[PDB]
Amino acid sequence: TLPDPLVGADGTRVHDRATWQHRRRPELLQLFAREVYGRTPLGRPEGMVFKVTTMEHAALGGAATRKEVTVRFGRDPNAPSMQLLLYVPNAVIARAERAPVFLGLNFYGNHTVHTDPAIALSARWIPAEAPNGANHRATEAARGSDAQKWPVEQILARGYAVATVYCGDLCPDRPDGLNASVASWLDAAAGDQRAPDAWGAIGVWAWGLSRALDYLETDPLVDASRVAVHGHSRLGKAALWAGAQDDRFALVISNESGCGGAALSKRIHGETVARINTVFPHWFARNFRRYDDHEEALPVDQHELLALVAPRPLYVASAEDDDWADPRGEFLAVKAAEPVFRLFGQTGPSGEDVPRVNEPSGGALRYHIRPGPHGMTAQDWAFYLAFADEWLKSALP
């Protein structure tokens, strides 16, 4: 059975938004940091540098302004960096208005999100699984290879900018990637083994998303107060943790994030804690390994991570055949987080069990399940865009 988000660690019943925001949220944040994702050792580093390396006002046949930006995490040119790609809808810019933004990481490099031949090929290590990679280096045959997950033209046509960063800029997704990571640089522990409570890939990815947001604040073309942070699967685990830690994010989307994302760990279904740490030992804190086949001992579950987004709108979604992500456990996490959203006057899914396919349910706390296998599809995006329209525009200038 689940720990109650609205009962403090000392048994105090949380009945008001101030106690939630100033006592219970820090408690839960610290528990997830120590026991699941590992500690984020700092937020914004001193000396971040933003360098716009390319800027095309007539990208995508004139539909967008495209910018590529090197976001460096310190002033020394020897500091680590990530490469941000930004498409801004020219229809909005031309009205002298700032665009809201969808922001999320990509799996295989910025050049894979769109065929746009002007995108810089990632110069970083790319996993063997990437489509049409050669020797773990980016090739131009990989251009647009992950475009199915990225309906850029539709997003732009609906009035949103699209921003993305390759997750491997921050931590290459391989069990040894943390030694070639942002974590490796910030790790001043001269020692070898990362500490038990030290962050892994998901914490490093989530931190990169907040650094992307830092950049968007400075970019005059976009409204960084209206950023929807989104991710698919492992990068949706990152999007949830980024959205929970960084309340500047206006809206958070978890597309089939599964185990250690939206799915309840204490529900033993599909991927389990032991399975995810065995296969992906770099993703979480070593402390999370304490809960291998010991989920009953977890002091939190993922409904409390969802609750860390409240009262900002949160969308959790599943795929019908995606048993490994445990769709029912993702839905039940939403339902167990709902009392925190309700504390702030927001509403979650109507009813007690999984809604029917392609029938989203909920107010600011929303869920859908779509037909088909694990993935991120045009149907998901259709629902996300309607959600963003409601929460980043409705009664807004």
Ligand SMILES: CO[C@H]1[C@H](O)[C@@H](O)[C@@H](O[C@H]2[C@H](O[C@@H]3CO[C@@H](O)[C@H](O)[C@H]3O)OC[C@@H](O[C@@H]3OC[C@@H](O)[C@H](O)[C@H]3O)[C@@H]2O)O[C@@H]1C(=O)O
């Ligand atoms: C939910 O996000 C993550 C999961 O946390 C990961 O476990 C991983 O899940 C995928 C699974 O991954 C394998 C688990 O078994 C291990 O032995 C193996 O080494 C892992 O590679 O692979 C199957 C995949 O579902 C497939 O997705 C595509 C869909 O078209 C197919 O029908 C599915 O079978 C599952 O996601 O990766 C997840 C992620 O996407 O980040």
Ligand SMILES: [K+]
């Ligand atoms: K801005």
Ligand SMILES: [Mg+2]
């Ligand atoms: Mg599970």
